[PDB]
Amino acid sequence: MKVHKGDTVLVISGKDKGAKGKVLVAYPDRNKVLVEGVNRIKKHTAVSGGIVTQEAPIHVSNVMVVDSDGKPTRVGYRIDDETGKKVRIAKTNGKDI
Amino acid sequence: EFPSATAKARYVRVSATKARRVIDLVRGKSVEEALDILRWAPQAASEPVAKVIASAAANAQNNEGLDPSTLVVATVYADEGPTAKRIRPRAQGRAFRIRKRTSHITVIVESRPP
Amino acid sequence: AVPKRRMSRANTRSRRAQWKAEAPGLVTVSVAGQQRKVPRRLLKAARLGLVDLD
Amino acid sequence: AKGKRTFQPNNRRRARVHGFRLRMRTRAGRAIVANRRSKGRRALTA
RNA sequence: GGCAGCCAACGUGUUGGCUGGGUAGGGGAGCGUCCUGCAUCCGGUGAAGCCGCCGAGUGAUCGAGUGGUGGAGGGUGUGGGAGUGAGAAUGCAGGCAUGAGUAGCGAUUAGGCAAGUGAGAACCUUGCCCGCCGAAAGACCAAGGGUUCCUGGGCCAGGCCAGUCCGCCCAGGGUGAGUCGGGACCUAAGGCGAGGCCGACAGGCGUAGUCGAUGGACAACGGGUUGAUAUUCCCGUACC
RNA sequence: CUGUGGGUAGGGGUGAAAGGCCAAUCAAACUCCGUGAUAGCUGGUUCUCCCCGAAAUGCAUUUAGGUGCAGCGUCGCAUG
RNA sequence: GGUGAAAAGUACCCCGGGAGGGGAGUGAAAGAGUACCUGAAACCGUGCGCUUACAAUCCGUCAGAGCCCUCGACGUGUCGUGGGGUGAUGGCGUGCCUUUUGAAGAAUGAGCCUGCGAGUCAGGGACAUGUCGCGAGGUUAACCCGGGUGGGGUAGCCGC
Ligand SMILES: [Mg+2]
Ligand SMILES: [Mg+2]
Ligand SMILES: [Mg+2]
Ligand SMILES: [Mg+2]
Ligand SMILES: [Mg+2]
Ligand SMILES: [Mg+2]
Ligand SMILES: [Mg+2]
Ligand SMILES: [Mg+2]
Ligand SMILES: [Mg+2]
Ligand SMILES: [Mg+2]
Ligand SMILES: [Mg+2]
Ligand SMILES: [Mg+2]
Ligand SMILES: [Mg+2]
Ligand SMILES: [Mg+2]
Ligand SMILES: [Mg+2]
Ligand SMILES: [Mg+2]
Ligand SMILES: [Mg+2]
Ligand SMILES: [Mg+2]
Ligand SMILES: [Mg+2]
Ligand SMILES: [Mg+2]
Ligand SMILES: [Mg+2]
Ligand SMILES: [Mg+2]
Ligand SMILES: [Mg+2]
Ligand SMILES: [Mg+2]
Ligand SMILES: [Mg+2]
Ligand SMILES: [Mg+2]
Ligand SMILES: [Mg+2]
Ligand SMILES: [Mg+2]
Ligand SMILES: [Mg+2]
Ligand SMILES: [Mg+2]
Ligand SMILES: [Mg+2]
Ligand SMILES: [Mg+2]
Ligand SMILES: [Mg+2]
Ligand SMILES: [Mg+2]
Ligand SMILES: [Mg+2]
Ligand SMILES: [Mg+2]
Ligand SMILES: [Mg+2]
Ligand SMILES: [Mg+2]
Ligand SMILES: [Mg+2]
Ligand SMILES: [Mg+2]
Ligand SMILES: [Mg+2]
Ligand SMILES: [Mg+2]
Ligand SMILES: [Mg+2]
Ligand SMILES: [Mg+2]
Ligand SMILES: [Mg+2]
Ligand SMILES: [Mg+2]
Ligand SMILES: [Mg+2]
Ligand SMILES: [Mg+2]
Ligand SMILES: [Mg+2]
Ligand SMILES: [Mg+2]
Ligand SMILES: [Mg+2]
Ligand SMILES: [Mg+2]
Ligand SMILES: [Mg+2]
Ligand SMILES: [Mg+2]
Ligand SMILES: [Mg+2]
Ligand SMILES: [Mg+2]
Ligand SMILES: [Mg+2]
Ligand SMILES: [Mg+2]
Ligand SMILES: [Mg+2]
Ligand SMILES: [Mg+2]
Ligand SMILES: [Mg+2]
Ligand SMILES: [Mg+2]
Ligand SMILES: [Mg+2]
Ligand SMILES: [Mg+2]
Ligand SMILES: [Mg+2]
Ligand SMILES: [Mg+2]
Ligand SMILES: [Mg+2]
Ligand SMILES: [Mg+2]
Ligand SMILES: [Mg+2]
Ligand SMILES: [Mg+2]
Ligand SMILES: [Mg+2]
C-alpha cells in the first residue's frame, strides 16, 4: 500500500497537517493507516471510570512517508536483480525509504 | 420570564387524546397540587403524566437548583406519536384495522414568585 | 344507518368537548405528623390508616 | 351443523399426488419441474 | 384612463377608425418543469429544496429583491429533445381524518375472602370456601402440528383490559425397545410395469414382475424411578 | 353410518336427476399462455392568453343513440 | 436505501421499575442521538391577538363600526396617497366535474393530502403546408473505406 507499519510518515492533509508520526497499524483493504500522535479522539468508556483519548485512522492519501533526511516523498520501486527483489525507493532523493 | 425546567416522555403507550383528558386537569397549577390531583384522579393516563411532571420538578431540583415549592406547571401538552396497525378479523371474512396509538407528553415548569 | 356527510370541525369539536374529566375535591389529613391530601370520601380511612399514602 | 373445510392434511397423499416422483414420471410434470427450477423456486415440488 | 384584433394615413412608429360574450371546434402567440450542444455567470463568505416578508406582470407566473431553515450544486442566453403540467378514470400506492372515545371485548359454569409476591395484582402463587363437568368439560391414542414439553430468565410486541402470568420472547435441557407401532415378512383395491402389442410422432394399454395396509403371520408382564422418557431405564420373573 | 387406501377430469367425469356436484366458484372448473382479446357502449384525458366560431338539418344506410357525403365553423390562397 | 468526515454512538450525575428524558460531555453542527441528510402537505396540539351564546349562513364577495399590530408626520395623541389581522352589521349570492333540450340539483363521480396515471413511436409510407439545398434536373438504397457525425456507391425512384 506503499505505506507500512513502523515507518515514519508526515500527515499531509487534514486537521493534524504538518505532524510527523509512526504508523502503528495499516488497514490495506480500507486504504487507511493508524499513526500515533495524530487524529486523536475522545471516547466515552462505560465502567477505571472515565473518558478515554486514543487515535483514529486517517486515509493513506493524507500522509506521505519521510525521507532519510526528513523530507516527505512519493515512493517508487526499483528492482534488485541480485535477489529478484522489488525495493522501495524515495522518488525525491533516489535512495531507500 | 421565569427560570424553567423541562421534561419529555416520548412513545408512551397512551392515546394522545386520552392523555390530554387528564392533562387538562393540571395545567397551570403548582407541582404539588398537580401531583395530588393526578394521584387521586381515577383515569389511568394519570400514571404517565404524573411521572413526567415529577421528572420536570427534579430537573429544577438538580440542574437549576431552585426552590421546590415555587414550581408551577406552566406548559404541558400531549403530541401524537407513531401508530402501529393491527387487524381484527370480523364476520364473514372481513378484516378491520386497529390503531395502537402513542404520545409524547411535554412539560415546562417555572419557578414563579409566591 | 350511515353518516351522510363527513362531519365538520366545528361540530366535531363541539361534542368532543363534552368528553372531559373533573378533578376530585381534596381535603387535608395529618398522618405520621405530616400533612397529605385525600378525597373527603377516604378521609376516615386515612385517619385510621387504611389508605396507602405513598 | 356440517363444518368440514376443503383442506384435510395428509403427508403421504400430498406426496403421492404432488410429489417429485409423480412429477417426473410423466412429461408435463418434468416440464413443470424444469419451469419451476428456471423461475427460481426454492421448493420445486411437494 | 389602460389593453388588444383587423385596417388606413403619413410614413417607418406613431396616430386614427372600426371591432374585442361564447360551448363543440379551427388558427396564433406564450408560461412553468426536466435532460442536453455552445457561451457566460453564481456558489461552504453557503447551491438546490422548503418556510416566510416585501413586492411585480395582461395570463400561465416572476422575484441575479430579501430573511429563516438547510448543506453541494445552480442561474442566464441561444439552439436541440421530451416519460413536460391532473381535481375527478366506483383510478393506483402510502400516510391520515369522519362516524367516535362510539359499537364491541366471542355463549348458554360463578366466583369470594385471607395471606404472599411485586414498582404496580379483579386476572399470578398458596390456603379455605362456593359453584360447573362427570358416556366428560376425565384417561389414553391415530391423523395432523412441530419443540408448543422441562428448568432458568423476561415482560417491548401478542393476550380483545392489566399482567409479576402465559401455548408469547430468550437460553440450556429433554424423547433410551429383540417383545410396543412400522420396515428388514405377506399380499388386496390399485400403481408402475423388462420384453410386448397398439398408435403419424407425442403416446395407450399390459404380461412376467415389483411395490402398495385399512387386512394375515410374529416373541413381556407387574412394580419403581426423573424437573422433563418409559411394556424402552431399573427391579422381579418371562418368552422368541 | 363411518375410518383408512384407492379410481373416474372439463364438452369431460359423476348424478335414486335438483342443470346437482367436480377444493367457500359450475348452462361447461381452475392456472398460465394467444393477450395490451374485442366492445357502433360507459368512463377519464393534466398550463395560459389572443382572434374567429357552430350543429342538433337533407340524403343513403343489417340503418334509426353509429357512419359516409352534403349543409353550417376555421385557417391558407385566388377573385373583388 | 441515506447518522457523521471519522463512532468521536452520549463517560458520570439526576427523575423514573423500565421506556423516556434533564444536566454534563462528542462533534462544524445533536434544528445530525444508531426512532438518525433535507423534512413539504394532509392530520394533531399548545400559547397569544380579534370575534362569537334572539340566531336560519354554497360559507363567499362588496360596503362597514369597534378593537389589535405596524410604518411616516407633526408632536406628545391625531392624521396619512398609508399597510396588515379580526370582523358587529347591511346588499348580492343555487358547489365542482361529467353528461344533457335543460342539473344547485334529490342524475354520475369525488373523505383528505402527497407521489403516480392518458394522442407516443417506427416507416426514402400517403396528402397538405412551412423552411433549406441544388435546379431541367433532384437524390442515392444495399454496400465499401473512416475509433465519429466524414467520404465514395447510378442499382433504382421521382420530373422530363
Ligand atoms: Mg489526500
Ligand atoms: Mg393514578
Ligand atoms: Mg372465517
Ligand atoms: Mg374495515
Ligand atoms: Mg349443512
Ligand atoms: Mg388601436
Ligand atoms: Mg372573444
Ligand atoms: Mg362586445
Ligand atoms: Mg427554475
Ligand atoms: Mg442550455
Ligand atoms: Mg466557481
Ligand atoms: Mg463551514
Ligand atoms: Mg437539477
Ligand atoms: Mg443561513
Ligand atoms: Mg435558501
Ligand atoms: Mg426548446
Ligand atoms: Mg405525464
Ligand atoms: Mg393529486
Ligand atoms: Mg382520486
Ligand atoms: Mg387509500
Ligand atoms: Mg377519530
Ligand atoms: Mg352514536
Ligand atoms: Mg350508546
Ligand atoms: Mg356497549
Ligand atoms: Mg371470552
Ligand atoms: Mg391480595
Ligand atoms: Mg352437577
Ligand atoms: Mg355417570
Ligand atoms: Mg379427555
Ligand atoms: Mg409450558
Ligand atoms: Mg407486555
Ligand atoms: Mg395487553
Ligand atoms: Mg416465569
Ligand atoms: Mg413458558
Ligand atoms: Mg432379542
Ligand atoms: Mg398387481
Ligand atoms: Mg418399454
Ligand atoms: Mg400400464
Ligand atoms: Mg412390501
Ligand atoms: Mg395395519
Ligand atoms: Mg410426561
Ligand atoms: Mg412400566
Ligand atoms: Mg365401507
Ligand atoms: Mg385418491
Ligand atoms: Mg352434467
Ligand atoms: Mg382454488
Ligand atoms: Mg363449490
Ligand atoms: Mg369446459
Ligand atoms: Mg364454452
Ligand atoms: Mg392477438
Ligand atoms: Mg380497449
Ligand atoms: Mg365574436
Ligand atoms: Mg360530416
Ligand atoms: Mg372548408
Ligand atoms: Mg462542543
Ligand atoms: Mg446543520
Ligand atoms: Mg421519522
Ligand atoms: Mg431528519
Ligand atoms: Mg347577540
Ligand atoms: Mg329568510
Ligand atoms: Mg355578508
Ligand atoms: Mg342571500
Ligand atoms: Mg346517462
Ligand atoms: Mg345528463
Ligand atoms: Mg332527460
Ligand atoms: Mg350530487
Ligand atoms: Mg343534495
Ligand atoms: Mg347515468
Ligand atoms: Mg359517492
Ligand atoms: Mg400510480
Ligand atoms: Mg413518422
DSSP states along A14-81: STTTT-EEEEEEEEGGGTEEEETTSSEEEEEE----EEEEEE--EEGGGEEEE-TTS-EE-EEEEEET
Instruction: Indicate which ligand has the atom closest to the C-alpha of B97.
Output: 4
* Alpha carbons B65 and B58: distance in angstroms, whole number: 9
DSSP state of C12: H
Q: Which grid cell is A15? A: 486537521
CB of B54 less than 8 A from some CB of C: no
Q: Which grid cell is C38? A: 385525600
**A36 close to A8: Cβ distance less than 8 angstroms:** no
Backbone φ and ψ of B91, nearest 5°? -65, 145
Helix (H, G, I), strand (E, B) or coil at C21: coil
B84 Cβ contacts chain E strand, under 7 Å: yes
- Give the ranges where chain D is alpha helix by DSSP (H): 11-18, 20-25, 28-39
Residues, chain C, total? 54
Q: Which grid cell is A31? A: 486504504
Q: Which grid cell is D31? A: 416440464
Resolution in angstroms comes to 3.0
Please tell me the number of Cα atoms within 13 Å of C48 on its side-chain side: 2
Strand pairing partners for A52? A43
* Alpha carbons D19 and D21: distance in angstroms, whole number: 6
* Alpha carbons A47 and A54: distance in angstroms, whole number: 17
List the C40 CA – G114 C1' distance (angstroms).
55
Contacts of A47 (CB under 8 A, 6+ apart): none
Strand pairing partners for A77? A88
* Alpha carbons C23 and B34: distance in angstroms, whole number: 10
Segment (H or E) for C15: helix C9-16
Helices (H) and strands (E) in chain C, counts: 2, 2
Residue with cell 415440488: D45
Q: Which grid cell is A44? A: 466515552
* Alpha carbons B16 and B105: distance in angstroms, whole number: 8
Question: Cβ atoms within 10 A of the Cβ of A60, count?
Answer: 20
Instruction: Output the CA torsion sign for B40, B41, B45, B49.
Output: negative
Distance B88 CA to ligand 21 centre (A): 18
Task: For residue B61, give how far its alpha carbon lies from the nearest alpha carbon of chain C (Å).
Answer: 20
DSSP state of B30: B
- Pick from B51, B59, B62, B49: which is nearest to B110 by CA? B59
Cα B68 to the chain's mean position, in Å? 20
Instruction: Indicate which ligand has the atom closest to the C-alpha of D16.
Output: 44
Question: Cβ atoms within 10 A of the Cβ of A59, count?
Answer: 12
Residue with cell 502503528: A24
Question: Cβ atoms within 10 A of the Cβ of B112, count?
Answer: 13
Q: Looking at this protein, which amino acid is placed at residue C35?
A: Q
Q: Looking at this protein, which amino acid is placed at residue B86?
A: R
Residues, chain B, total? 114
